[model samples]
Target: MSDIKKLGSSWIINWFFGFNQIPTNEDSSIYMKSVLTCAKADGVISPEEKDWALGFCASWGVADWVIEDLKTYEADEALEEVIARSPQVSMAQRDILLSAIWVSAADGELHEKEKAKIRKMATILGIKEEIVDQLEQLYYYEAALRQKRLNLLYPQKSPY
Candidate 1:
Protein backbone atom coordinates (compact mmCIF):
# COMPACT_ATOMS: atom_id res chain seq x y z
CA MET A 1 0.00 0.00 0.00
CA SER A 2 2.58 2.57 -1.04
CA ASP A 3 -0.50 4.56 -2.18
CA ILE A 4 1.34 5.90 -5.22
CA LYS A 5 -1.55 6.40 -7.60
CA LYS A 6 0.33 9.38 -8.97
CA LEU A 7 2.73 7.41 -11.19
CA GLY A 8 1.83 3.98 -12.52
CA SER A 9 5.34 2.69 -13.32
CA SER A 10 6.62 3.61 -9.87
CA TRP A 11 3.71 1.81 -8.27
CA ILE A 12 4.33 -1.31 -10.31
CA ILE A 13 8.03 -1.37 -9.51
CA ASN A 14 7.43 -0.91 -5.79
CA TRP A 15 4.25 -2.98 -5.46
CA PHE A 16 4.75 -5.71 -8.04
CA PHE A 17 7.38 -8.43 -8.05
CA GLY A 18 8.29 -7.92 -11.69
CA PHE A 19 10.79 -5.10 -11.07
CA ASN A 20 12.59 -5.28 -7.77
CA GLN A 21 16.20 -5.71 -8.76
CA ILE A 22 17.31 -2.49 -10.50
CA PRO A 23 19.84 -0.41 -8.63
CA THR A 24 17.85 2.11 -6.57
CA ASN A 25 20.21 4.98 -7.32
CA GLU A 26 20.73 4.06 -10.94
CA ASP A 27 18.09 4.84 -13.57
CA SER A 28 19.07 2.31 -16.22
CA SER A 29 19.37 -1.42 -16.46
CA ILE A 30 20.90 -3.03 -19.53
CA TYR A 31 17.40 -3.96 -20.56
CA MET A 32 15.24 -1.19 -19.04
CA LYS A 33 17.48 1.58 -20.30
CA SER A 34 17.36 0.30 -23.84
CA VAL A 35 13.59 0.17 -23.82
CA LEU A 36 13.31 3.69 -22.46
CA THR A 37 15.45 5.02 -25.29
CA CYS A 38 13.60 3.17 -28.00
CA ALA A 39 10.07 3.62 -26.69
CA LYS A 40 10.61 7.33 -26.36
CA ALA A 41 11.92 7.59 -29.92
CA ASP A 42 8.57 9.03 -30.92
CA GLY A 43 8.69 11.79 -28.25
CA VAL A 44 6.33 11.39 -25.29
CA ILE A 45 5.57 8.70 -22.71
CA SER A 46 1.80 8.71 -22.55
CA PRO A 47 0.16 7.39 -19.37
CA GLU A 48 -1.52 4.54 -21.25
CA GLU A 49 1.71 3.57 -23.00
CA LYS A 50 3.70 3.92 -19.78
CA ASP A 51 1.28 1.45 -18.20
CA TRP A 52 2.74 -1.20 -20.46
CA ALA A 53 6.25 0.23 -20.48
CA LEU A 54 6.43 0.20 -16.69
CA GLY A 55 5.26 -3.38 -16.61
CA PHE A 56 8.00 -4.18 -19.09
CA CYS A 57 10.50 -2.48 -16.78
CA ALA A 58 9.33 -4.58 -13.87
CA SER A 59 9.79 -7.62 -16.01
CA TRP A 60 13.42 -6.54 -16.36
CA GLY A 61 13.95 -6.36 -12.55
CA VAL A 62 13.53 -2.69 -11.72
CA ALA A 63 12.31 -2.49 -8.13
CA ASP A 64 8.94 -0.88 -7.37
CA TRP A 65 10.55 1.66 -5.06
CA VAL A 66 12.96 2.42 -7.87
CA ILE A 67 10.02 2.91 -10.20
CA GLU A 68 8.66 5.45 -7.73
CA ASP A 69 11.66 7.57 -8.59
CA LEU A 70 11.04 7.13 -12.29
CA LYS A 71 7.47 8.40 -11.80
CA THR A 72 8.78 11.84 -10.97
CA TYR A 73 9.77 11.86 -14.63
CA GLU A 74 7.44 13.79 -16.90
CA ALA A 75 6.78 13.12 -20.59
CA ASP A 76 9.10 16.02 -21.36
CA GLU A 77 11.99 14.35 -19.56
CA ALA A 78 14.50 13.39 -22.22
CA LEU A 79 17.37 10.92 -22.12
CA GLU A 80 19.62 14.00 -22.06
CA GLU A 81 17.90 15.06 -18.86
CA VAL A 82 19.18 11.97 -17.11
CA ILE A 83 22.62 12.37 -18.63
CA ALA A 84 22.74 16.03 -17.65
CA ARG A 85 21.04 16.07 -14.25
CA SER A 86 21.25 12.59 -12.77
CA PRO A 87 24.57 11.60 -11.31
CA GLN A 88 23.93 7.88 -11.68
CA VAL A 89 23.41 8.14 -15.40
CA SER A 90 26.15 9.15 -17.82
CA MET A 91 27.35 8.92 -21.41
CA ALA A 92 27.44 5.24 -20.57
CA GLN A 93 23.69 5.53 -20.27
CA ARG A 94 23.61 5.28 -24.05
CA ASP A 95 23.67 1.61 -23.29
CA ILE A 96 20.29 2.06 -21.63
CA LEU A 97 19.06 4.07 -24.58
CA LEU A 98 19.92 1.22 -26.87
CA SER A 99 17.91 -1.13 -24.66
CA ALA A 100 14.97 1.21 -24.40
CA ILE A 101 14.79 1.16 -28.18
CA TRP A 102 14.66 -2.59 -28.47
CA VAL A 103 11.98 -3.44 -25.90
CA SER A 104 9.79 -0.50 -26.79
CA ALA A 105 9.38 -1.92 -30.26
CA ALA A 106 8.93 -5.46 -28.94
CA ASP A 107 5.17 -4.88 -28.93
CA GLY A 108 5.17 -4.26 -32.72
CA GLU A 109 2.51 -1.54 -32.55
CA LEU A 110 5.20 1.18 -32.24
CA HIS A 111 3.14 4.05 -30.85
CA GLU A 112 3.79 7.45 -32.44
CA LYS A 113 4.57 9.17 -29.15
CA GLU A 114 7.21 6.56 -28.44
CA LYS A 115 8.75 7.04 -31.91
CA ALA A 116 9.47 10.67 -31.19
CA LYS A 117 11.05 9.80 -27.89
CA ILE A 118 13.30 7.25 -29.58
CA ARG A 119 14.68 9.91 -31.91
CA LYS A 120 15.22 12.14 -28.93
CA MET A 121 16.97 9.31 -27.15
CA ALA A 122 19.16 8.71 -30.17
CA THR A 123 20.20 12.34 -30.22
CA ILE A 124 21.15 12.13 -26.58
CA LEU A 125 22.81 8.77 -27.13
CA GLY A 126 24.76 10.24 -30.06
CA ILE A 127 23.69 7.62 -32.57
CA LYS A 128 22.56 8.40 -36.09
CA GLU A 129 19.15 7.57 -37.59
CA GLU A 130 20.71 5.01 -39.91
CA ILE A 131 21.99 3.09 -36.93
CA VAL A 132 18.81 3.53 -34.93
CA ASP A 133 16.72 2.22 -37.80
CA GLN A 134 18.93 -0.82 -38.03
CA LEU A 135 18.59 -1.42 -34.31
CA GLU A 136 14.84 -0.82 -34.32
CA GLN A 137 14.21 -3.25 -37.16
CA LEU A 138 16.35 -5.88 -35.52
CA TYR A 139 14.19 -5.78 -32.39
CA TYR A 140 11.05 -5.57 -34.46
CA TYR A 141 11.87 -8.83 -36.16
CA GLU A 142 12.82 -10.48 -32.91
CA ALA A 143 9.58 -9.44 -31.27
CA ALA A 144 7.69 -10.64 -34.31
CA LEU A 145 9.22 -14.06 -33.91
CA ARG A 146 8.34 -14.01 -30.24
CA GLN A 147 4.79 -13.12 -31.13
CA LYS A 148 4.62 -15.99 -33.54
CA ARG A 149 6.09 -18.39 -31.03
CA LEU A 150 3.70 -17.37 -28.27
CA ASN A 151 0.66 -17.01 -30.47
CA LEU A 152 1.13 -20.18 -32.50
CA LEU A 153 1.84 -22.33 -29.46
CA TYR A 154 -1.29 -21.40 -27.53
CA PRO A 155 -3.67 -19.54 -29.78
CA GLN A 156 -6.24 -19.22 -27.04
CA LYS A 157 -4.03 -18.09 -24.17
CA SER A 158 -1.51 -16.04 -26.13
CA PRO A 159 -1.46 -12.37 -25.10
CA TYR A 160 -0.01 -11.26 -28.42
Candidate 2:
Protein backbone atom coordinates (compact mmCIF):
# COMPACT_ATOMS: atom_id res chain seq x y z
CA MET A 1 0.00 0.00 0.00
CA SER A 2 1.13 3.54 -0.74
CA ASP A 3 0.39 4.50 2.82
CA ILE A 4 2.76 1.89 4.15
CA LYS A 5 5.42 2.90 1.70
CA LYS A 6 4.85 6.48 2.66
CA LEU A 7 6.09 5.67 6.12
CA GLY A 8 9.47 5.04 4.46
CA SER A 9 12.16 2.38 4.83
CA SER A 10 14.08 4.35 7.44
CA TRP A 11 11.18 4.18 9.87
CA ILE A 12 10.66 0.52 9.07
CA ILE A 13 14.33 -0.28 9.45
CA ASN A 14 14.47 1.58 12.76
CA TRP A 15 11.27 0.02 14.02
CA PHE A 16 11.51 -3.65 13.05
CA PHE A 17 15.27 -3.73 12.64
CA GLY A 18 17.74 -2.25 15.11
CA PHE A 19 18.85 1.02 13.55
CA ASN A 20 19.87 3.57 16.11
CA GLN A 21 18.23 6.94 15.39
CA ILE A 22 18.78 7.93 18.99
CA PRO A 23 20.56 11.33 18.86
CA THR A 24 23.51 10.95 21.20
CA ASN A 25 25.67 8.24 22.70
CA GLU A 26 24.61 9.32 26.18
CA ASP A 27 20.93 8.93 25.34
CA SER A 28 21.66 5.67 23.57
CA SER A 29 23.50 4.44 26.65
CA ILE A 30 20.50 5.24 28.82
CA TYR A 31 18.24 3.41 26.42
CA MET A 32 20.63 0.45 26.34
CA LYS A 33 20.83 0.29 30.10
CA SER A 34 17.05 0.44 30.32
CA VAL A 35 16.86 -2.48 27.87
CA LEU A 36 19.46 -4.47 29.77
CA THR A 37 17.65 -4.01 33.05
CA CYS A 38 14.29 -4.95 31.55
CA ALA A 39 15.73 -8.03 29.86
CA LYS A 40 17.22 -9.23 33.11
CA ALA A 41 14.06 -8.56 35.15
CA ASP A 42 12.61 -11.96 34.31
CA GLY A 43 15.59 -13.81 35.82
CA VAL A 44 16.55 -15.48 32.53
CA ILE A 45 17.65 -13.71 29.38
CA SER A 46 16.92 -15.76 26.27
CA PRO A 47 19.45 -15.97 23.46
CA GLU A 48 17.12 -14.05 21.19
CA GLU A 49 16.87 -11.26 23.74
CA LYS A 50 20.62 -11.12 24.28
CA ASP A 51 21.26 -11.00 20.55
CA TRP A 52 18.77 -8.20 20.05
CA ALA A 53 20.18 -6.21 22.97
CA LEU A 54 23.75 -6.56 21.74
CA GLY A 55 22.73 -5.64 18.23
CA PHE A 56 20.99 -2.57 19.61
CA CYS A 57 24.19 -1.59 21.40
CA ALA A 58 26.28 -2.18 18.30
CA SER A 59 23.89 -0.04 16.28
CA TRP A 60 24.26 2.76 18.80
CA GLY A 61 28.07 2.75 18.37
CA VAL A 62 28.61 1.79 21.98
CA ALA A 63 32.17 0.52 22.40
CA ASP A 64 32.81 -3.21 22.75
CA TRP A 65 34.56 -2.69 26.07
CA VAL A 66 31.58 -0.77 27.42
CA ILE A 67 29.29 -3.51 26.23
CA GLU A 68 31.57 -6.08 27.88
CA ASP A 69 31.51 -4.11 31.12
CA LEU A 70 27.72 -4.31 31.16
CA LYS A 71 28.04 -8.02 31.83
CA THR A 72 28.49 -7.20 35.50
CA TYR A 73 25.98 -4.31 35.59
CA GLU A 74 23.23 -4.85 38.10
CA ALA A 75 19.93 -3.01 38.14
CA ASP A 76 19.30 -2.88 41.91
CA GLU A 77 19.37 0.84 42.83
CA ALA A 78 20.96 1.98 39.62
CA LEU A 79 17.74 1.52 37.63
CA GLU A 80 16.18 4.52 39.34
CA GLU A 81 19.31 6.50 38.68
CA VAL A 82 19.22 5.62 34.99
CA ILE A 83 15.54 6.41 34.76
CA ALA A 84 16.06 9.73 36.47
CA ARG A 85 18.92 10.59 34.21
CA SER A 86 16.78 10.07 31.09
CA PRO A 87 15.67 13.07 29.04
CA GLN A 88 12.70 14.87 30.53
CA VAL A 89 11.01 15.50 27.19
CA SER A 90 7.80 13.47 26.93
CA MET A 91 8.63 12.05 23.50
CA ALA A 92 12.03 10.83 24.61
CA GLN A 93 10.48 9.38 27.73
CA ARG A 94 7.97 7.45 25.65
CA ASP A 95 10.66 6.17 23.30
CA ILE A 96 12.82 5.10 26.21
CA LEU A 97 9.98 3.17 27.83
CA LEU A 98 8.98 1.70 24.48
CA SER A 99 12.55 0.57 23.81
CA ALA A 100 12.65 -1.08 27.20
CA ILE A 101 9.35 -2.80 26.53
CA TRP A 102 10.46 -3.81 23.05
CA VAL A 103 13.55 -5.55 24.38
CA SER A 104 11.58 -7.12 27.22
CA ALA A 105 9.36 -8.82 24.68
CA ALA A 106 12.21 -9.70 22.33
CA ASP A 107 12.36 -13.36 23.38
CA GLY A 108 8.64 -13.83 22.50
CA GLU A 109 6.28 -13.32 25.40
CA LEU A 110 6.65 -10.38 27.75
CA HIS A 111 7.09 -12.08 31.09
CA GLU A 112 5.11 -10.83 34.10
CA LYS A 113 8.27 -9.79 35.87
CA GLU A 114 9.38 -7.88 32.81
CA LYS A 115 6.07 -6.10 32.53
CA ALA A 116 6.13 -5.21 36.21
CA LYS A 117 9.63 -3.90 35.94
CA ILE A 118 8.60 -1.77 32.97
CA ARG A 119 5.66 -0.41 34.91
CA LYS A 120 7.99 0.69 37.65
CA MET A 121 10.29 2.20 35.09
CA ALA A 122 7.37 4.09 33.62
CA THR A 123 6.50 5.36 37.05
CA ILE A 124 9.99 6.69 37.44
CA LEU A 125 9.79 8.28 33.99
CA GLY A 126 6.49 9.95 34.94
CA ILE A 127 4.58 8.07 32.27
CA LYS A 128 1.08 6.91 33.04
CA GLU A 129 0.06 3.24 33.17
CA GLU A 130 -2.27 3.54 30.20
CA ILE A 131 0.57 4.89 28.05
CA VAL A 132 2.65 1.84 28.84
CA ASP A 133 -0.22 -0.45 27.92
CA GLN A 134 -0.79 1.50 24.72
CA LEU A 135 2.90 1.31 23.79
CA GLU A 136 2.95 -2.45 24.43
CA GLN A 137 0.00 -2.92 22.10
CA LEU A 138 1.57 -0.53 19.61
CA TYR A 139 4.71 -2.68 19.46
CA TYR A 140 2.75 -5.76 18.36
CA TYR A 141 0.65 -3.76 15.93
CA GLU A 142 3.75 -2.29 14.31
CA ALA A 143 5.28 -5.74 14.06
CA ALA A 144 2.16 -7.07 12.37
CA LEU A 145 2.09 -4.11 10.01
CA ARG A 146 5.70 -4.74 9.06
CA GLN A 147 4.79 -8.34 8.18
CA LYS A 148 1.82 -7.14 6.19
CA ARG A 149 3.96 -4.67 4.27
CA LEU A 150 6.47 -7.41 3.47
CA ASN A 151 3.67 -9.67 2.30
CA LEU A 152 2.30 -6.97 0.08
CA LEU A 153 5.68 -6.40 -1.52
CA TYR A 154 6.57 -10.06 -1.87
CA PRO A 155 3.44 -12.16 -1.73
CA GLN A 156 5.04 -15.12 -3.42
CA LYS A 157 7.65 -15.46 -0.72
CA SER A 158 5.40 -14.52 2.17
CA PRO A 159 6.13 -16.84 5.08
CA TYR A 160 2.57 -16.67 6.35
Candidate 3:
Protein backbone atom coordinates (compact mmCIF):
# COMPACT_ATOMS: atom_id res chain seq x y z
CA MET A 1 0.00 0.00 0.00
CA SER A 2 3.00 2.28 -0.14
CA ASP A 3 2.88 5.26 -2.45
CA ILE A 4 6.10 4.04 -4.03
CA LYS A 5 4.11 1.47 -6.01
CA LYS A 6 2.56 4.38 -7.87
CA LEU A 7 6.06 5.04 -9.20
CA GLY A 8 6.13 1.57 -10.90
CA SER A 9 9.65 1.79 -12.28
CA SER A 10 11.89 -1.08 -11.18
CA TRP A 11 14.68 1.45 -10.78
CA ILE A 12 12.65 3.45 -8.32
CA ILE A 13 11.18 0.34 -6.70
CA ASN A 14 14.51 -0.90 -5.40
CA TRP A 15 15.58 2.57 -4.33
CA PHE A 16 12.50 3.06 -2.17
CA PHE A 17 11.76 -0.38 -0.71
CA GLY A 18 15.40 -1.18 0.01
CA PHE A 19 16.03 2.20 1.54
CA ASN A 20 13.00 2.01 3.81
CA GLN A 21 13.80 -1.47 5.11
CA ILE A 22 17.07 -0.44 6.72
CA PRO A 23 17.00 1.20 10.14
CA THR A 24 17.70 4.93 10.55
CA ASN A 25 17.53 7.49 13.37
CA GLU A 26 16.45 10.52 11.42
CA ASP A 27 12.84 11.64 11.48
CA SER A 28 12.67 11.00 7.74
CA SER A 29 13.99 8.75 5.02
CA ILE A 30 16.65 10.29 2.78
CA TYR A 31 14.23 9.82 -0.07
CA MET A 32 11.47 11.50 1.91
CA LYS A 33 13.80 14.36 2.78
CA SER A 34 14.44 14.85 -0.89
CA VAL A 35 10.71 14.80 -1.53
CA LEU A 36 10.00 17.43 1.12
CA THR A 37 12.81 19.62 -0.15
CA CYS A 38 11.60 19.40 -3.71
CA ALA A 39 7.90 19.45 -2.88
CA LYS A 40 8.28 22.85 -1.27
CA ALA A 41 10.49 24.22 -3.99
CA ASP A 42 7.68 26.49 -5.11
CA GLY A 43 7.36 27.82 -1.53
CA VAL A 44 4.42 25.77 -0.36
CA ILE A 45 3.51 22.16 0.44
CA SER A 46 -0.25 22.12 0.21
CA PRO A 47 -1.94 19.95 2.82
CA GLU A 48 -2.72 17.33 0.20
CA GLU A 49 0.89 17.14 -0.92
CA LYS A 50 2.34 17.28 2.58
CA ASP A 51 0.19 14.39 3.76
CA TRP A 52 1.39 12.15 0.94
CA ALA A 53 5.02 13.12 1.52
CA LEU A 54 4.64 12.49 5.24
CA GLY A 55 3.69 8.87 4.65
CA PHE A 56 7.20 8.15 3.40
CA CYS A 57 8.79 9.26 6.64
CA ALA A 58 6.12 8.14 9.04
CA SER A 59 6.05 4.56 7.83
CA TRP A 60 9.80 4.26 8.31
CA GLY A 61 9.63 5.65 11.87
CA VAL A 62 11.08 9.08 11.17
CA ALA A 63 11.17 11.45 14.13
CA ASP A 64 9.03 14.51 14.76
CA TRP A 65 11.96 16.92 14.53
CA VAL A 66 12.82 15.78 11.06
CA ILE A 67 9.18 16.11 10.04
CA GLU A 68 9.02 19.53 11.65
CA ASP A 69 12.02 20.75 9.64
CA LEU A 70 10.14 20.32 6.39
CA LYS A 71 7.02 21.96 7.78
CA THR A 72 8.91 25.01 9.09
CA TYR A 73 11.83 25.58 6.72
CA GLU A 74 11.73 28.52 4.31
CA ALA A 75 11.22 26.40 1.21
CA ASP A 76 13.33 28.44 -1.21
CA GLU A 77 16.20 28.59 1.25
CA ALA A 78 15.76 24.90 1.93
CA LEU A 79 16.05 24.13 -1.74
CA GLU A 80 19.25 26.16 -1.90
CA GLU A 81 20.66 24.27 1.06
CA VAL A 82 19.66 20.95 -0.50
CA ILE A 83 21.36 21.87 -3.77
CA ALA A 84 24.53 23.04 -2.06
CA ARG A 85 24.79 20.18 0.41
CA SER A 86 24.79 17.42 -2.14
CA PRO A 87 28.12 16.61 -3.82
CA GLN A 88 26.93 13.76 -5.98
CA VAL A 89 23.53 12.73 -7.19
CA SER A 90 22.74 9.02 -7.04
CA MET A 91 19.95 7.09 -8.77
CA ALA A 92 17.87 7.18 -5.60
CA GLN A 93 18.15 10.94 -5.50
CA ARG A 94 17.03 11.26 -9.09
CA ASP A 95 13.97 9.11 -8.49
CA ILE A 96 13.28 11.10 -5.36
CA LEU A 97 13.14 14.22 -7.47
CA LEU A 98 10.88 12.44 -9.89
CA SER A 99 8.57 11.54 -7.03
CA ALA A 100 8.56 15.14 -5.96
CA ILE A 101 7.48 16.13 -9.42
CA TRP A 102 4.59 13.67 -9.17
CA VAL A 103 3.60 15.10 -5.80
CA SER A 104 3.67 18.64 -7.18
CA ALA A 105 1.27 17.62 -9.89
CA ALA A 106 -0.92 15.50 -7.59
CA ASP A 107 -3.63 18.08 -6.96
CA GLY A 108 -4.56 17.92 -10.66
CA GLU A 109 -2.66 21.06 -11.63
CA LEU A 110 1.05 21.58 -11.98
CA HIS A 111 2.04 25.15 -11.24
CA GLU A 112 4.63 27.02 -13.31
CA LYS A 113 6.53 27.70 -10.12
CA GLU A 114 6.58 24.00 -9.27
CA LYS A 115 7.76 23.04 -12.75
CA ALA A 116 10.53 25.66 -12.63
CA LYS A 117 11.52 24.50 -9.20
CA ILE A 118 11.80 20.88 -10.35
CA ARG A 119 13.85 21.91 -13.38
CA LYS A 120 16.17 23.88 -11.11
CA MET A 121 16.63 20.91 -8.78
CA ALA A 122 17.36 18.61 -11.68
CA THR A 123 19.93 21.11 -12.92
CA ILE A 124 21.67 21.33 -9.55
CA LEU A 125 21.49 17.58 -9.07
CA GLY A 126 23.02 16.87 -12.47
CA ILE A 127 19.93 15.13 -13.82
CA LYS A 128 19.44 15.74 -17.53
CA GLU A 129 16.32 17.46 -18.79
CA GLU A 130 15.58 14.54 -21.07
CA ILE A 131 15.32 12.14 -18.16
CA VAL A 132 13.08 14.55 -16.29
CA ASP A 133 10.90 14.96 -19.36
CA GLN A 134 10.59 11.21 -19.67
CA LEU A 135 9.63 10.87 -16.03
CA GLU A 136 7.00 13.59 -16.42
CA GLN A 137 5.42 11.88 -19.37
CA LEU A 138 5.47 8.51 -17.65
CA TYR A 139 3.81 9.90 -14.57
CA TYR A 140 1.11 11.54 -16.69
CA TYR A 141 0.48 8.27 -18.47
CA GLU A 142 0.34 6.41 -15.17
CA ALA A 143 -2.32 8.77 -13.90
CA ALA A 144 -4.41 8.25 -16.98
CA LEU A 145 -3.97 4.51 -16.75
CA ARG A 146 -4.94 4.53 -13.10
CA GLN A 147 -8.14 6.40 -13.85
CA LYS A 148 -9.03 4.05 -16.66
CA ARG A 149 -8.45 1.08 -14.36
CA LEU A 150 -10.68 2.62 -11.74
CA ASN A 151 -13.37 3.22 -14.33
CA LEU A 152 -13.26 -0.42 -15.33
CA LEU A 153 -13.43 -1.54 -11.72
CA TYR A 154 -16.30 0.75 -10.82
CA PRO A 155 -18.36 1.76 -13.80
CA GLN A 156 -21.12 2.85 -11.43
CA LYS A 157 -18.92 5.60 -9.98
CA SER A 158 -17.47 6.92 -13.20
CA PRO A 159 -15.41 10.08 -13.39
CA TYR A 160 -17.58 11.33 -16.21
- lDDT per residue for candidate 1 within 1-160, as digits (tens), equals 2344325545455553244433353554423444454465555445655566666565544456656755565544445554655454554444455556555554556666666767776776787888777867876787789879977899896555
Q: Tell me model 2's lDDT, rounded to 2 decimals.
A: 0.65
Q: Please give the RMSD to the true structure for each candidate, in Å.
A: 7.6, 7.0, 6.1
Candidate 2 contains a number of clashing pairs equal to 0
What does the lDDT read for residue 10 in candidate 2?
Answer: 38
Candidate 3 residue-wise lDDT, 28-85, digit = tens: 3445666777777647778788776665555444556667765655444454455444
Query: What tens-digit string does per-residue lDDT give for candidate 2 at 66-158?
Result: 567555656444455665675532336677677777677777777678888788767766789999899889988977898799878998865
Regions of model 3 farther than 4 Å from truth: 1-28, 56-91, 157-160
Q: Could you estimate the TM-score for every candidate?
A: 0.58, 0.66, 0.66
CA displacement after TM-score superposition, residue 133 of candidate 3 (Å): 0.4
Return the lDDT, model 2, position 2.
Answer: 46
How does residue 31 of candidate 2 score in lDDT? 60
Cα displacement (angstroms), candidate 2, residue 74, comes to 4.0
Q: Which ten residues in a row have the lowest lDDT in candidate 2?
A: 1-10
